Amino acid sequence: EVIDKKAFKDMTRNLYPLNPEQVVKLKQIYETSEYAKAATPGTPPKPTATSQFVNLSPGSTPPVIRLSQGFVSSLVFLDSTGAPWPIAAYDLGDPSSFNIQWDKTSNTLMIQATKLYNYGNLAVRLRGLNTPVMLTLIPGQKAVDYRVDLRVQGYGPNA
Amino acid sequence: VNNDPAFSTTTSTGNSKNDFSAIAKQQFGVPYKSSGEVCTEYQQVCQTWG
Amino acid sequence: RVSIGGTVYTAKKYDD
């Protein structure tokens, strides 16, 4: 009847071949595996919500927005008195690297970098401005602009 | 083996004309007599390789 | 016994 005993020890080996020590071994191995896969190269961008004054006179450099691959950056458009400026429309350069969403009435442009460091620019004409607003969008910086309170030079339909 | 275009590790996008044949892009050659002429027989002595 | 470092650290022989 030890025939039976050796059969059974043998296949407590075979059917379930990882003694439960080995199964938590593999669980932890995979844990570290895709924790390493989850690791970011270097320090990630600092999440900052900034505010900038937009200067539209000739000779001024355009506002520059820090982005990051796969992160939302929201641009809100504000007049000199701090009231919202609804957007007329926008035209983004190279949207194969950037993805922009906007509900068609509001004044919030939410942009993600679909590529790591490929930068571009974006024009946005507003309700009250004949001249639109330029912004150069650079991803992969040491900071990520979660939101930019850009302060347009003019006075909008809200005063 | 590296000579055979069918065994070219690269894609066959280069010269499809310069190849000597479908089995070798360059011929190995034929023995020649000591005159630079084609040595088709042994009795005509072959010394060089043209 | 196996840790969360992935390295195996085992007790030797004891009883209770």
């Binding site: 896969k37 691959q69 796969g70 939302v72 993805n99 969403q101 509900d103 939410m110 993600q112 679909t114 590529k115 | - | -």
Partner: protein, 46 residues
Amino acid sequence: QKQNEQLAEQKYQQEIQQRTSDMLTAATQLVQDWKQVETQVYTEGT
């Protein structure tokens, strides 16, 4: 006796390249899980 060292070199040589093929099948698989970007979803409320 240089021959036996030569085929000893032969014997413990295949390991680097089969390990190599294994790591490529791993690494290309990784890098494509890297090249993805999930388009972000706007949900407008009621």
